[PDB]
Design a protein around this ligand. Structure first.
Ligand SMILES: [Mg+2]
Ligand SMILES: [Mg+2]
Ligand SMILES: [Mg+2]
Ligand SMILES: [Mg+2]
Ligand SMILES: [Mg+2]
Ligand SMILES: [Mg+2]
Ligand SMILES: [Mg+2]
Ligand SMILES: [Mg+2]
Ligand SMILES: [Mg+2]
Ligand SMILES: [Mg+2]
Ligand SMILES: [Mg+2]
Ligand SMILES: [Mg+2]
Ligand SMILES: [Mg+2]
Ligand SMILES: [Mg+2]
Ligand SMILES: [Mg+2]
Ligand SMILES: [Mg+2]
Ligand SMILES: [Mg+2]
Ligand SMILES: [Mg+2]
Ligand SMILES: [Mg+2]
Ligand SMILES: [Mg+2]
Ligand SMILES: [Mg+2]
Ligand SMILES: [Mg+2]
Ligand SMILES: [Mg+2]
Ligand SMILES: [Mg+2]
Ligand SMILES: [Mg+2]
Ligand SMILES: [Mg+2]
Ligand SMILES: [Mg+2]
Ligand SMILES: [Mg+2]
Ligand SMILES: [Mg+2]
Ligand SMILES: [Mg+2]
Ligand SMILES: [Mg+2]
Ligand SMILES: [Mg+2]
Ligand SMILES: [Mg+2]
Ligand SMILES: [Mg+2]
Ligand SMILES: [Mg+2]
Ligand SMILES: [Mg+2]
Ligand SMILES: [Mg+2]
Ligand SMILES: [Mg+2]
Ligand SMILES: [Mg+2]
Ligand SMILES: [Mg+2]
Ligand SMILES: [Mg+2]
Ligand SMILES: [Mg+2]
Ligand SMILES: [Mg+2]
Ligand SMILES: [Mg+2]
Ligand SMILES: [Mg+2]
Ligand SMILES: [Mg+2]
Ligand SMILES: [Mg+2]
Ligand SMILES: [Mg+2]
Ligand SMILES: [Mg+2]
Ligand SMILES: [Mg+2]
Ligand SMILES: [Mg+2]
Ligand SMILES: [Mg+2]
Ligand SMILES: [Mg+2]
Ligand SMILES: [Mg+2]
Ligand SMILES: [Mg+2]
Ligand SMILES: [Mg+2]
Ligand SMILES: [Mg+2]
Ligand SMILES: [Mg+2]
Ligand SMILES: [Mg+2]
Ligand SMILES: [Mg+2]
Ligand SMILES: [Mg+2]
Ligand SMILES: [Mg+2]
Ligand SMILES: [Mg+2]
Ligand SMILES: [Mg+2]
Ligand SMILES: [Mg+2]
Ligand SMILES: [Mg+2]
Ligand SMILES: [Mg+2]
Ligand SMILES: [Mg+2]
Ligand SMILES: [Mg+2]
Ligand SMILES: [Mg+2]
Ligand SMILES: [Mg+2]
Ligand SMILES: [Mg+2]
Ligand SMILES: [Mg+2]
Ligand SMILES: [Mg+2]
Ligand SMILES: [Mg+2]
Ligand SMILES: [Mg+2]
Ligand SMILES: [Mg+2]
Ligand SMILES: [Mg+2]
Ligand SMILES: [Mg+2]
Ligand SMILES: [Mg+2]
Ligand SMILES: [Mg+2]
Ligand SMILES: [Mg+2]
Ligand SMILES: [Mg+2]
Ligand SMILES: [Mg+2]
Ligand SMILES: [Mg+2]
Ligand SMILES: [Mg+2]
Ligand SMILES: [Mg+2]
Ligand SMILES: [Mg+2]
Ligand SMILES: [Mg+2]
Ligand SMILES: [Mg+2]
Ligand SMILES: [Mg+2]
Ligand SMILES: [Mg+2]
Ligand SMILES: [Mg+2]
Ligand SMILES: [Mg+2]
Ligand SMILES: [Mg+2]
Ligand SMILES: [Mg+2]
Ligand SMILES: [Mg+2]
Ligand SMILES: [Mg+2]
Ligand SMILES: [Mg+2]
Ligand SMILES: [Mg+2]
Ligand SMILES: [Mg+2]
Ligand SMILES: [Mg+2]
Ligand SMILES: [Mg+2]
Ligand SMILES: [Mg+2]
Ligand SMILES: [Mg+2]
Ligand SMILES: [Mg+2]
Ligand SMILES: [Mg+2]
Ligand SMILES: [Mg+2]
Ligand SMILES: [Mg+2]
Ligand SMILES: [Mg+2]
Ligand SMILES: [Mg+2]
Ligand SMILES: [Mg+2]
Ligand SMILES: [Mg+2]
Ligand SMILES: [Mg+2]
Ligand SMILES: [Mg+2]
Ligand SMILES: [Mg+2]
Ligand SMILES: [Mg+2]
Ligand SMILES: [Mg+2]
Ligand SMILES: [Mg+2]
Ligand SMILES: [Mg+2]
Ligand SMILES: [Mg+2]
Ligand SMILES: [Mg+2]
Ligand SMILES: [Mg+2]
Ligand SMILES: [Mg+2]
Ligand SMILES: [Mg+2]
Ligand SMILES: [Mg+2]
Ligand SMILES: [Mg+2]
Ligand SMILES: [Mg+2]
Ligand SMILES: [Mg+2]
Ligand SMILES: [Mg+2]
Ligand SMILES: [Mg+2]
Ligand SMILES: [Mg+2]
Ligand SMILES: [Mg+2]
Ligand SMILES: [Mg+2]
Ligand SMILES: [Mg+2]
Ligand SMILES: [Mg+2]
Ligand SMILES: [Mg+2]
Ligand SMILES: [Mg+2]
Ligand SMILES: [Mg+2]
Ligand SMILES: [Mg+2]
Ligand SMILES: [Mg+2]
Ligand SMILES: [Mg+2]
Ligand SMILES: [Mg+2]
Ligand SMILES: [Mg+2]
Ligand SMILES: [Mg+2]
Ligand SMILES: [Mg+2]
Ligand SMILES: [Mg+2]
Ligand SMILES: [Mg+2]
Ligand SMILES: [Mg+2]
Ligand SMILES: [Mg+2]
Ligand SMILES: [Mg+2]
Ligand SMILES: [Mg+2]
Ligand SMILES: [Mg+2]
Ligand SMILES: [Mg+2]
Ligand SMILES: [Mg+2]
Ligand SMILES: [Mg+2]
Ligand SMILES: [Mg+2]
Ligand SMILES: [Mg+2]
Ligand SMILES: [Mg+2]
Ligand SMILES: [Mg+2]
Ligand SMILES: [Mg+2]
Ligand SMILES: [Mg+2]
Ligand SMILES: [Mg+2]
Ligand SMILES: [Mg+2]
Ligand SMILES: [Mg+2]
Ligand SMILES: [Mg+2]
Ligand SMILES: [Mg+2]
Ligand SMILES: [Mg+2]
Ligand SMILES: [Mg+2]
Ligand SMILES: [Mg+2]
Ligand SMILES: [Mg+2]
Ligand SMILES: [Mg+2]
Ligand SMILES: [Mg+2]
Ligand SMILES: [Mg+2]
Lengths: 120, 55, 114, 122, 211
RNA sequence: AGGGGAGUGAAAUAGAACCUGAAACCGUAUGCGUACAAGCAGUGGGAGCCUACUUGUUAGGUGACUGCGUACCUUUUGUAU
RNA sequence: AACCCACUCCCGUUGAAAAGGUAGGGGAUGACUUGUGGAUCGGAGUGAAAGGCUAAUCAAGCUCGGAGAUAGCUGGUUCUC
RNA sequence: AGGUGGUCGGGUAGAGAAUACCAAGGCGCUUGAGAGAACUCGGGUGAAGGAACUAGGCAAAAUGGCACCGUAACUUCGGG
RNA sequence: CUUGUCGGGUAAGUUCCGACCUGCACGAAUGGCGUAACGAUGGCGGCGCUGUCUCCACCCGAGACUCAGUGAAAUUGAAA
RNA sequence: UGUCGGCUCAUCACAUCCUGGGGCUGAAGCCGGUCCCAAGGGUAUGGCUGUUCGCCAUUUAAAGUGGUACGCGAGCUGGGUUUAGAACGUCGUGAGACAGUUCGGUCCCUAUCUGCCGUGGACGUUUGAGAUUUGAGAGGGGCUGCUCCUAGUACGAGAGGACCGGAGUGGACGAACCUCUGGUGUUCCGGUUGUCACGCCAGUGGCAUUGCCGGGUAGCUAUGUUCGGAAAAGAUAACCGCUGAAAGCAUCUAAGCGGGAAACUUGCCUCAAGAUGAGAUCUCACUGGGAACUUGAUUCCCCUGAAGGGCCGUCGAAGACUACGACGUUGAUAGGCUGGGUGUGUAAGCGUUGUGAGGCGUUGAGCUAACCAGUACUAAUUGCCCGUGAGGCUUGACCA
């Protein structure tokens, strides 16, 4: 049974699931548009979106908290300087998911994840 | 465990009466007339009258 | 769950002072041994607590006549007539279940003076 | 809850130190004995000049359990060990003193004698 | 029996009596039921009343159901139910609230039990497991034997096997009404009610009663 | 890769895995039958429908319904076994 | 510990493997383990002895000959009246 | 997932060529994606009992280091 | 014959230990009777420990299930 | 055609062990003995032994007897027995033997068909559709102790001790549930060992079985909580009758009228019109033309496709895939956000005290999964496909 439970296993251990979403969020902040499998994109918004919320208030304790959850110095600086000021007046919903077909190799459903207000 | 008699031609064709394939939901973009999967970005990179990825 | 909250909120009128795990408390328990109604005292250290509104509870532990006994009280039950803190304890944990394996002088709780 | 092969100490002064449950009485296929339940025990250790011997089969009442007993308001009382009181053929205690506290579920007509002798009744 | 109300299961709580007793209680919210149709002997055979409760948005109501709901000026709700009444009179548009019940008043509650997906014989039928050691080979929770040798030489119909502990319709009998709330439209019933929070339940007077 | 034309040839459905090209086996098209019915699948009877021409005492294809009906070989006193 | 071995459970049994794996186990300066080269063989060899081993073959190896051994025993034996 | 002789063999802990985390160097084991039923395999925790299991404590749980104190019957006087 | 009989151990012991002698059918280098140390050796009994069990519950990975690709096996007189 | 015993799961008979109804008794009562009716439901745990049995210990209302390949190894085991090793007694010159002992000794198979447990697709139910239904039929369930009152009454010299009727509380079994008591909770919070890294200090992160641990939310769950077995009606069994002749009496029977059991039919719960005998009720939708005939339940073309269904998407205490349930901008379906709740237990930085480890303050701080409430910030498109165009004929009765 699974009643009222959140979270996908994705056929990994809990430690390897955590490392993978840590990597995915770092890539998303750096490139602002990435392509991945649809189930992975839906579990990613429960990790990346709370990090953008935390960067709205800039302080030493917040930046350390962001670094503990993204062990990346470039990601901590992209937050707190660009993301967090761009979404200061945005009440959630910072990333958007769009289905984009299937892979040729294994017929896996794919999706686009991008930030809502990319400068371009 | 294995069969004691071989299946007839008719018997195995009845098992395959559920093997048929269904079709997909296709839509046409009003701006360009291009066919795409319903609720999916088109192969040219459009969705709901907007350019999303531009290849 | 919004209307269960209102049904439970009408049954919570007792005073219920503030205490913490590790405190030494005295609980007056209502006993009816027939028609006569008296109060009994239960003195011991609070080893656990449970904050759930109407379903709140706390467990206290004592040594009666060379035998350890511990009772879990329902906080808003009418059987709990009153409660008072005798001493305050200085502990780091929320549940003091390690006191079950300690017996005499090793089971003492430091006192929180202020 | 007490079942066969459970060891429990003696809250009486009848000379026994440890007894083992060998039967839970009062029903076919009955599994557990709680506080106030009559059981059949064998004496495992005894005092040199007690009034019971080692290897003697007799009847006891369970007086104190680690599983505990629940009250009508939802509360529960637990103890740090299992204890029993040995009884004779007419179902009265064999000793003359009772050590440790007991509970109010024991205030029945047939066990009211041992309630009075108990230092504390919880 | 023969008449009841439809409600939603809100959850469980306690009532503390003044003498210090805790009563386990299930809270049932009964929105006031509305009479949609009345069936009599001469025009349907049997004799019953058809009822609805709740609300349903207009885009989700069909034209066949809108016309049925409009013969009685009664408005559309979620679901429709009948109660097989013995000798009672009701007219289209009538209301039925918690006011047909009192404190005391043993009642029957019917619901749809929680669904376990596909259960084994140990959980579904309370079979007993085999050895976990002493040489057992990949057969710890398996059902064992299912028949005999050449005589009959088949499995008997109704044999207990595995699959789908149901989300079925079950009835719990002789439950005591602790509190009737007419202003909040609440029924407080002692004990457990089948189903999950938010499910549909039917409350009827107890069929056995007597004792 | 493989094909559709065009050409060569008496002939490419003689195209190089190349004379002829059977059977098992696998398909596409058309006609009739088949979703309340129990078994060696056939046979005696038999309506209806389709096709052809001599327009029905005819030929071809299907076979609703119904009576009977437990494969072949070997070995045996004896086999649906 | 390495290295040599193979006591127990489980898995695997159409195996990853025609004898393994994980987890535990024994010996581990000696009657030890191991590389290279050499010697002994078919009624023969070798054997701290189990009828063990002698190229996944052993109460007498493999290969080719006598040789189409012999088989009072099973099986099969082909068109018509 | 087997077998195959010899040589080299760093750091921090450590008695160590054990073990753990790393260096130089090498690799992610040539089908993937999902979902999170029974059941099978390999594991974690478990109320109250504590061998009642079973042919049998099989399996599991448990013990586990260094220093010091202390240690029985028996003995071939080494031992135990 | 036989679970001989007596004693001990257990609430209860066809196994175990100590004896008796009626040895179906022990017996002295196919050695008799003892024996410290040793044994992945056989039998019995304790302490600790426990999912072995009462009686199973939850959780974690690998399969099983679905989708895409590749693609076996034993078996088989014919089957409405 | 795998042969004992154990485990798991059973199904039937009645020659009945308990519970139910009776006759006789060498039946005072409480207990019994024997026979008749009755198969609804029940019907031990252990010590020894490979044992089935048996004997013991302690229970129980009771610990039934048998059939089913002495039920059940393509469900498990492998202690016994019946391969190969070794030993004892006995027999044989010996190789060896014993239905005599003793220690050791590999249990294969991915389910085609029938069967069974679940869950779907197609078609039909005579125009189609949304919804609610009757009940032919079938399954489930059905056990029982003790205590008290009648009443220390009937009975009995006493000891002792009821029938009938009423109330309470248990055991075993089953269902549902998670408020409480607990378990779990590798998705929440802390402590800590070794090592590597983030330039370094501080602070953190990876790996070590989740490294080892201490707690714990939702969900799931029992050992926790609640409920159940009925009462009652009918037709009967054995049995007990009423009236009553054949046969002036007698006689339950021949005519007629009764009482009567956990068995049978209902009553309680669940499924149920594929019940092809395909039932019923409420409401909704569709009201254009030609052509050819082999001239009516016919075929073809143009036009027009409603009620509704599905595809698709966001999901679900629903789920193997399905199916089922809610929603799709006229929107709270999912995520986020904002509040709260819950858990953990006083973060970082700074300031003080100390030589330092550490302490103290800011500070019940910081963080917080699945929970509660609100909010369109993100994602649920602006679409396609099925489904048609008034529903045959005969007979009868009412209307026109
Ligand atoms: Mg959810
Ligand atoms: Mg996978
Ligand atoms: Mg890890
Ligand atoms: Mg097969
Ligand atoms: Mg077959
Ligand atoms: Mg065959
Ligand atoms: Mg065969
Ligand atoms: Mg055959
Ligand atoms: Mg198929
Ligand atoms: Mg479910
Ligand atoms: Mg259950
Ligand atoms: Mg069992
Ligand atoms: Mg078991
Ligand atoms: Mg095996
Ligand atoms: Mg296993
Ligand atoms: Mg048959
Ligand atoms: Mg069954
Ligand atoms: Mg030409
Ligand atoms: Mg040709
Ligand atoms: Mg040619
Ligand atoms: Mg030629
Ligand atoms: Mg050719
Ligand atoms: Mg051919
Ligand atoms: Mg075909
Ligand atoms: Mg037909
Ligand atoms: Mg029929
Ligand atoms: Mg058939
Ligand atoms: Mg004919
Ligand atoms: Mg013809
Ligand atoms: Mg015919
Ligand atoms: Mg025929
Ligand atoms: Mg026939
Ligand atoms: Mg016939
Ligand atoms: Mg033959
Ligand atoms: Mg023969
Ligand atoms: Mg013969
Ligand atoms: Mg003969
Ligand atoms: Mg014949
Ligand atoms: Mg045959
Ligand atoms: Mg060897
Ligand atoms: Mg192991
Ligand atoms: Mg090993
Ligand atoms: Mg060596
Ligand atoms: Mg040496
Ligand atoms: Mg040497
Ligand atoms: Mg050696
Ligand atoms: Mg050498
Ligand atoms: Mg050589
Ligand atoms: Mg040679
Ligand atoms: Mg030779
Ligand atoms: Mg030789
Ligand atoms: Mg030899
Ligand atoms: Mg030899
Ligand atoms: Mg030999
Ligand atoms: Mg060779
Ligand atoms: Mg060889
Ligand atoms: Mg020879
Ligand atoms: Mg010759
Ligand atoms: Mg020959
Ligand atoms: Mg021969
Ligand atoms: Mg002969
Ligand atoms: Mg033959
Ligand atoms: Mg032959
Ligand atoms: Mg080697
Ligand atoms: Mg090193
Ligand atoms: Mg070592
Ligand atoms: Mg390693
Ligand atoms: Mg590394
Ligand atoms: Mg490197
Ligand atoms: Mg691979
Ligand atoms: Mg497991
Ligand atoms: Mg395991
Ligand atoms: Mg494990
Ligand atoms: Mg464990
Ligand atoms: Mg835990
Ligand atoms: Mg435990
Ligand atoms: Mg414990
Ligand atoms: Mg113990
Ligand atoms: Mg035992
Ligand atoms: Mg046993
Ligand atoms: Mg066993
Ligand atoms: Mg062991
Ligand atoms: Mg264990
Ligand atoms: Mg282990
Ligand atoms: Mg271990
Ligand atoms: Mg010793
Ligand atoms: Mg003997
Ligand atoms: Mg003897
Ligand atoms: Mg004896
Ligand atoms: Mg034993
Ligand atoms: Mg013994
Ligand atoms: Mg002896
Ligand atoms: Mg003798
Ligand atoms: Mg001898
Ligand atoms: Mg001599
Ligand atoms: Mg001799
Ligand atoms: Mg000797
Ligand atoms: Mg040795
Ligand atoms: Mg040896
Ligand atoms: Mg020994
Ligand atoms: Mg024993
Ligand atoms: Mg489980
Ligand atoms: Mg799993
Ligand atoms: Mg595929
Ligand atoms: Mg596939
Ligand atoms: Mg029968
Ligand atoms: Mg009878
Ligand atoms: Mg009987
Ligand atoms: Mg009688
Ligand atoms: Mg008789
Ligand atoms: Mg019976
Ligand atoms: Mg029976
Ligand atoms: Mg029966
Ligand atoms: Mg019957
Ligand atoms: Mg009945
Ligand atoms: Mg037993
Ligand atoms: Mg035994
Ligand atoms: Mg009894
Ligand atoms: Mg039987
Ligand atoms: Mg048998
Ligand atoms: Mg039997
Ligand atoms: Mg087996
Ligand atoms: Mg067997
Ligand atoms: Mg097997
Ligand atoms: Mg079988
Ligand atoms: Mg079979
Ligand atoms: Mg098997
Ligand atoms: Mg054996
Ligand atoms: Mg031998
Ligand atoms: Mg001799
Ligand atoms: Mg061995
Ligand atoms: Mg068949
Ligand atoms: Mg069949
Ligand atoms: Mg039927
Ligand atoms: Mg039944
Ligand atoms: Mg029934
Ligand atoms: Mg019973
Ligand atoms: Mg709970
Ligand atoms: Mg826990
Ligand atoms: Mg550390
Ligand atoms: Mg560094
Ligand atoms: Mg550093
Ligand atoms: Mg600090
Ligand atoms: Mg540092
Ligand atoms: Mg660290
Ligand atoms: Mg690392
Ligand atoms: Mg590692
Ligand atoms: Mg590493
Ligand atoms: Mg450890
Ligand atoms: Mg933990
Ligand atoms: Mg907890
Ligand atoms: Mg919980
Ligand atoms: Mg009756
Ligand atoms: Mg007369
Ligand atoms: Mg008469
Ligand atoms: Mg008559
Ligand atoms: Mg009657
Ligand atoms: Mg009854
Ligand atoms: Mg009856
Ligand atoms: Mg129908
Ligand atoms: Mg039918
Ligand atoms: Mg109908
Ligand atoms: Mg429409
Ligand atoms: Mg639609
Ligand atoms: Mg889904
Ligand atoms: Mg709104
Ligand atoms: Mg949301
Ligand atoms: Mg918030
Ligand atoms: Mg809190
Ligand atoms: Mg502080
Ligand atoms: Mg601080
Ligand atoms: Mg920290
Ligand atoms: Mg403070
Ligand atoms: Mg807090």
């Amino acid at each position: 049974m699974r009643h009222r439970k959140s979270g996908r296993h994705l056929s990994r251990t809990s430690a390897h699931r955590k490392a993978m979403f840590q990597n995915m969020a770092v890539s998303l902040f750096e490139h602002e548009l990435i392509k991945t499998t649809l189930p992975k994109a839906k579990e990613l918004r429960r990790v990346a979106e709370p990090l953008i919320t935390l960067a709205k208030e800039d302080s030493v304790a917040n930046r350390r908290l962001a670094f503990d959850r993204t062990r990346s110095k470039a990601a901590v600086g992209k937050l707190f300087n660009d993301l967090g000021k761009r979404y200061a007046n945005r009440p959630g919903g910072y990333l958007r998911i769009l289905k984009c077909g299937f892979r040729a190799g294994d017929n896996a459903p794919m999706a686009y994840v991008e930030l809502v207000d990319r400068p371009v | 465990a294995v069969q004691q008699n071989k299946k007839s031609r008719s018997a195995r064709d009845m098992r395959r009466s559920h093997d048929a394939l269904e079709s997909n939901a296709l839509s046409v973009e009003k701006s360009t007339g291009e066919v795409h999967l319903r609720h999916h970005v088109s192969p040219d990179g459009f969705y709901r009258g907007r350019k999303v990825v531009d290849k | 769950n919004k209307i269960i909250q209102q049904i439970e909120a009408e049954q919570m009128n007792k005073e219920i002072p503030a205490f913490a795990p590790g405190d030494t408390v005295i609980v007056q328990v209502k006993v009816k041994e027939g028609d006569r109604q008296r109060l009994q005292a239960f003195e011991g250290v609070v080893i656990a607590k449970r904050n759930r509104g109407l379903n709140s509870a706390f467990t206290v532990r004592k040594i009666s006549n060379g035998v350890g006994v511990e009772r879990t009280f329902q906080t808003y039950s009418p059987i709990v007539d009153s409660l008072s803190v005798k001493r305050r304890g200085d502990v780091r944990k929320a549940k003091l279940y390690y006191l079950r394996a300690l017996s005499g002088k090793a089971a003492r709780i430091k006192e929180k003076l202020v | 809850m007490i079942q066969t092969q459970s060891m429990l100490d003696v809250a009486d002064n009848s000379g026994a130190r440890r007894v083992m449950c060998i039967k839970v009485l009062g029903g076919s296929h009955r599994r557990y004995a709680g506080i106030g339940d009559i059981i059949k025990v064998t004496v495992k250790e005894a005092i040199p000049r007690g009034k019971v011997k080692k290897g003697q089969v007799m009847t006891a009442v369970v007086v104190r359990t680690k599983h505990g007993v629940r009250r009508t308001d939802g509360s529960i009382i637990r103890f740090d060990g299992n204890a029993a009181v040995l009884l004779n053929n007419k179902q009265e205690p064999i000793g003359t003193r009772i050590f440790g506290p007991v509970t109010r579920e024991l205030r029945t007509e047939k066990f009211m004698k041992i309630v009075s002798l108990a230092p504390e009744v919880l | 029996m023969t008449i009841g109300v439809v409600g939603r299961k809100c959850g469980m709580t306690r009532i503390f009596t003044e003498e210090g007793v805790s009563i386990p209680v299930t809270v049932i919210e009964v929105e006031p039921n509305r009479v949609t149709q009345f069936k009599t002997e001469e025009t349907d055979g049997y004799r019953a009343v058809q009822v609805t409760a709740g609300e349903r948005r207009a885009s989700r109501v069909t034209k066949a159901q809108a016309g049925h709901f409009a013969k009685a000026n009664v408005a559309a709700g979620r679901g429709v139910w009948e109660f097989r009444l013995g000798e009672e009179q009701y007219a289209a548009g009538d209301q039925i609230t918690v006011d047909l019940f009192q404190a005391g008043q043993m009642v029957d509650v019917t619901g749809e039990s929680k669904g376990k997906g596909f259960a084994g014989t140990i959980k579904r039928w309370n079979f007993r497991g085999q050895d976990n050691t002493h040489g057992n080979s990949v057969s710890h929770r398996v059902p064992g034997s299912i028949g005999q040798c050449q005589t009959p030489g088949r499995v008997f119909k109704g044999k207990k096997m595995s699959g789908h502990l149901g989300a079925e319709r079950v009835t719990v009998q002789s439950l005591e009404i602790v509190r009737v709330d007419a202003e909040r439209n609440l029924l407080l019933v002692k004990g457990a009610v089948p189903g999950a929070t938010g499910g549909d339940v039917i409350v009827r007077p107890a069929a056995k009663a007597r004792g």
